[PDB]
């Protein structure tokens, strides 16, 4: 299932991934409270706000 970033988000280390609005990603899992999801883009992996993405 493919996703798209709704807003830009900037990684602040901490295993996070910066993503740009309109970028496509794959979602590989969620953290315990669901606020973060493990994303994979063309640029790499890392955690991104679950609220910042939606399926394509």
């Amino acid at each position: 299932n493919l996703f798209v970033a709704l807003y830009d988000f900037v990684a602040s280390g901490d295993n996070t991934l910066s993503i740009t609005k309109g970028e496509k990603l794959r979602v590989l899992g969620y953290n315990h409270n669901g606020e973060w999801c493990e994303a994979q883009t063309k640029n790499g992996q890392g955690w991104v706000p679950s609220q910042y993405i939606t399926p394509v």
């Binding site: 807003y7 953290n31 955690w47 609220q51 910042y52």
Partner: peptide, 10 residues
């Protein structure tokens, strides 16, 4: 994953 909250949607 980060322990802290994500930024709310803009």
């Amino acid at each position: 994953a980060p322990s802290y909250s994500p930024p709310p949607p803009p």
